[PDB]
Amino acid sequence: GTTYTIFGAGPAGLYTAWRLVTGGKAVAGDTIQLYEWGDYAFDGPGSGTRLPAGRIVTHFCNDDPKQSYIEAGGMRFIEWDGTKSQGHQLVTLTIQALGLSGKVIDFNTTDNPLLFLREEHIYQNDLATHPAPYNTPGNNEQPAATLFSNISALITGDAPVSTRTQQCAFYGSGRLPSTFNSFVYPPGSIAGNIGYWNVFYDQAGNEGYEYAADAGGYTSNVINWNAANAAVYNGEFAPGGAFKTVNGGYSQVFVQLYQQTLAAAQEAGVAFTLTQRTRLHSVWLEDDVVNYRLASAENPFKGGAVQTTQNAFLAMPPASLDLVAEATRYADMPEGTLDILNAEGVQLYMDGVIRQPSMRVMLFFDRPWWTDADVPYPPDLTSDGAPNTFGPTITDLPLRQVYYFGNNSDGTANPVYGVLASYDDMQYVQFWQELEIDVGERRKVPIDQDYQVLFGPRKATDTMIRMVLLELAKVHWGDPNAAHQIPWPVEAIFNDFSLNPFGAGYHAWAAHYDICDVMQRIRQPTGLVPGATAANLFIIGEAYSNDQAWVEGAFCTAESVLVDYYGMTTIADTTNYPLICAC
């Protein structure tokens, strides 16, 4: 029979295993072996150190599955709308196929976010009468979204950028219009070769860019990524749709993928195993044969015996690929082998994305203190005639965004009220990292070897809690001394996604890349080595997807490999929804 070897039991790896079994590619006598560096709880409470999987982690207060939770990784999705050909199609189909559609609930955000900008408090609806304190004439009396839409329209001109296929085409063929007005960028410049921040800065000035970066919504990405993709993902015609979440947490999607793959595998006579605390150490090819070594979590740098497979999936992000590639980069390899991950074209294409570091502080309170009548600037979470919302509040601080989940339990547990504090971007990674160690302690673990998110949300230090309460005091009172009015959290924990093996909260397509060509060709990296024998060794996950902010992208790259390289029938309707861009 046939063995399918999957390295990484994140969303992409779990989805792959589930499709091979339920789609009937893996038949009685076949083997699917899943290897995961971490030790996730797939088999209920006590079966792991955190819920699955990868950068999705539902965190229950007190690790009590009946309690309020905060998503310490990915938190929401966009429901597929087949009439609009918009939304997370594979996520929506997968939730339905797993029997979880009944648990889908609205994720409501406020129409009127509090903006805390240069020590001013402005509810976004008041910008016409209380201009934002940025020297950007016109723009400062409008929500940042208006400036986003205006900058996108200066880049896309009259190009069609409304459909997913049109957006994909703009990545490769999109040019600045004949009317582009710039000292720096000529009309007709290839937009894929331009940095988004570079051109936003050119067109709107430092104050226009800073306002957009500080006051913009969660889903508008202002890093210096590919301007062609950024323009179509931040513009008037950006993909949208209704935000939803899975009541009880996103992590149950990954528990169910595992459990239902195992039950379907038993019915089909397929051998499906998950081996945790076991990482891919090194990988290489001998013609079509994938050679690999594993390492234990206890001793992650030391390989075991050389193993072979004909089918290998690297279901892991760039920083994770880098650690594997480092194990052969400097090695004297056996005669007639191909050190595939270190081939020039593979390395070049792996650099087709840039990295955004992220840190999430999760705090549970015994009361929703932000709703008290005497809070000077409460978050605008519940308008009359509309539903309740989770915020956010949006700031120019290190603590750039706050969500207020409150009591999201079934209400049977002792009520606690959750807050999510978001820290992001290269600017701030060194700011938050020193809060991760107690003020009475020296560092003990080399930073590159602290696999904190892999293990689970880490207890917040007293310094970390006090910093979050100081920033929330400035946001909601405008007085740092008001931190004394905030009750001390009953639990506070963090996830620092900049740490290995994740190395990033988010990936974004880089300037100076043909995105469609990287999306197409990086999946089977032998294709990037002239004269190499084809091997069924694949790279999958959200990082090289067309949906980088989302589990959808991890599913879509995985689906595209099953379709293109295993001839499987897609579960999606791709007529208006290319899983990845075609060139």
Ligand X SMILES: NC(=[NH2+])NCCC[C@H](N)C(=O)O
Q: Does 7 bind ligand FAD (CB under 6 A)?
A: yes
192 binds ligand FAD (CB under 6 A): no
What tokens were used for 49? Answer: 């150190």
* Binding-site member from 467, 519, 529, 581 for a copy of itself (CB under 8 A): 467
Identify the three-state secondary structure at position 13. helix
83-112: contacts with ligand FAD (CB under 6 A)? none
Looking at the Cβ atoms of 147 and 253, the one nearer to ligand FAD is 253
Q: Could you give the C-alpha distances from 205 to 135, 137, 179, 181, 212, in angstroms and in order?
A: 9, 11, 19, 13, 11
Give the residue, chosen from 25, 121, 164, 360, that forms a contact with ligand FAD under the rule CB under 6 A: 360
Selected from 312, 469, 511, 551, the binder of ligand FAD by CB under 6 A is 551
Residue at token pair 């800065």:
201
Q: Which does 205 bind (CB under 5 to 8 A by kind): ligand FAD, a copy of itself, ligand X, none?
A: a copy of itself
Decide: is 429 part of the binding site for a copy of itself (CB under 8 A). yes
Distance CA 6, CA 33 (A): 6
Cα–Cα distance, 565 to 123 (Å, whole number): 51
| Dist. CA 480–CA 362, nearest whole Å | 20
- Write the DSSP assignment of 136-184 as a string of letters: -TTGGGS-HHHHHHHHHHHHHTTS--SSHHHHHHHHHH-B--TT---SS
Give dist(CA 51, CA 49) in Å, integer. Answer: 7
38 binds ligand FAD (CB under 6 A): yes
What are the percentages of helix, strand and coil residues in the chain, rounded to 5?
35, 20, 45
CA distance 555 to 51: 19
326 interacts with, out of ligand X, a copy of itself, ligand FAD, none, CB within 5 to 8 A per kind: a copy of itself
The answer, yes or no, to whether the previous bond of 53 is cis (omega within 30 of 0) is yes
**Residue 510 binds ligand FAD, judged by CB under 6 A:** no
Among 48, 239, 352, 541, binds ligand FAD (CB under 6 A): 541
Least CB distance to ligand X at residue 302 (A): 35
- Using DSSP, state whether 454 is helix, strand or coil: helix
User: Per CB under 6 A, does 315 bind ligand FAD?
Assistant: yes
User: For residues 257-270, b (16+ Cβ closer than 10 Å) or e, as one string?
Assistant: bbebbbebbeebeb
For CA atoms 18, 23, 27, 28, give the dihedral sign: positive
Query: Which pair of tokens denotes residue 411?
Result: 């209400």
Find the binder of a copy of itself among 247, 512, 576, 582 (CB under 8 A). Answer: 512
Q: What phi and psi values does residue 337 have, to the nearest 5 degrees?
A: -95, 160
Is the distance from CB of 432 to CB of 398 less than 8 angstroms? yes
Pick one of ligand X, ligand FAD, a copy of itself, none as the site partner of residue 247 (Cβ within 5 to 8 A by kind). Answer: none
Among 14, 21, 53, 473, binds a copy of itself (CB under 8 A): 473
- Among 249, 501, 525, 578, which residue interacts with ligand FAD (rule: CB under 6 A)? 501
- Beta strands across the sheet bearing 120-123: 120-123, 114-117, 393-395, 401-406, 417-424, 358-365, 491-496, 458-459
Among 153, 297, 375, 470, binds a copy of itself (CB under 8 A): 470
Q: Which is nearer to ligand FAD, 315 or 397 (CB)?
A: 315
Query: Is 75 near ligand FAD (CB under 6 A)?
Result: yes
DSSP for 359-394? EEEEEEESS-GGG-TT-SS----B-TTS-B----EE
Q: Which does 497 bind (CB under 5 to 8 A by kind): a copy of itself, ligand FAD, ligand X, none?
A: ligand FAD
Binding to a copy of itself, residues 521-550 (CB under 8 A): none
**Which stretch in 71-79, 87-95, 127-135, 366-374 sits in contact with a copy of itself by CB under 8 A?**
127-135
Do residues 138 and 235 lie in contact, with contact meaning Cβ atoms separated by under 8 Å? no
316 binds, among a copy of itself, ligand FAD, ligand X, none (CB under 5 to 8 A by kind): ligand FAD
When binding is defined by CB under 6 A, the residue of 554, 561, 571, 572 that contacts ligand FAD is 554
DSSP 328: H
Q: Is 84 in the site for a copy of itself (CB under 8 A)?
A: no
Residue 439 interface partner, choices ligand X, a copy of itself, ligand FAD, none, CB cut-off 5-8 Å depending on type? a copy of itself
- Give the integer Cα–Cα distance in Å for 291 and 327: 13
Q: Binding mask 128-167 vs ligand FAD (x if CB under 6 A, - otherwise)?
A: ----------------------------------------
> Under the criterion CB under 8 A, does residue 306 sit at the interface with a copy of itself?
no
- Which of ligand FAD, a copy of itself, ligand X, none interacts with 218 (beta carbon under 5 to 8 A by kind)? ligand X
Q: At what angle do helices 227-234 and 196-215 cross, to 10 degrees?
A: 40
Among ligand X, ligand FAD, a copy of itself, none, the one that 542 touches (CB under a kind-dependent 5 to 8 A) is: ligand FAD
**Tokens standing for residue 145:** 């979204």
Give the per-residue contact string, 85-124, with a copy of itself (x = CB under 8 A; - = no).
---------------------------------xxx----
Q: How far is the CB of 369 from a copy of itself (least distance, A)?
A: 16
Measuring CA to CA, how many Å separate 68 from each of 55, 93, 245, 401? Answer: 20, 27, 14, 20
Distances in whole angstroms, Cα of residue 483 to Cα of each of 379, 488, 555: 16, 10, 42
Chain positions 326 to 385 lying near a copy of itself, rule: CB under 8 A, are 326-332, 342, 344, 347-348, 350-351, 354
Chain residues that interact with ligand X, rule: CB under 6 A: 75-76, 218-219, 221, 233, 356, 506, 549-550
What is the size of the binding site for ligand FAD (CB under 6 A)? 40
Q: Can you tell me which of 481, 530, 531, 567 binds a copy of itself, judged by CB under 8 A?
A: 481
Phi/psi at 405 (nearest 5 deg)?
Answer: -80, -25
Candidate residues 463, 563, 565, 583; the one interacting with a copy of itself per rule CB under 8 A: 463
Where does this chain bind ligand FAD (CB under 6 A)?
7-13, 35-38, 53-56, 73-77, 279-280, 315-317, 320, 324, 358, 360, 454, 497, 501-502, 505, 541-542, 550-551, 553-554
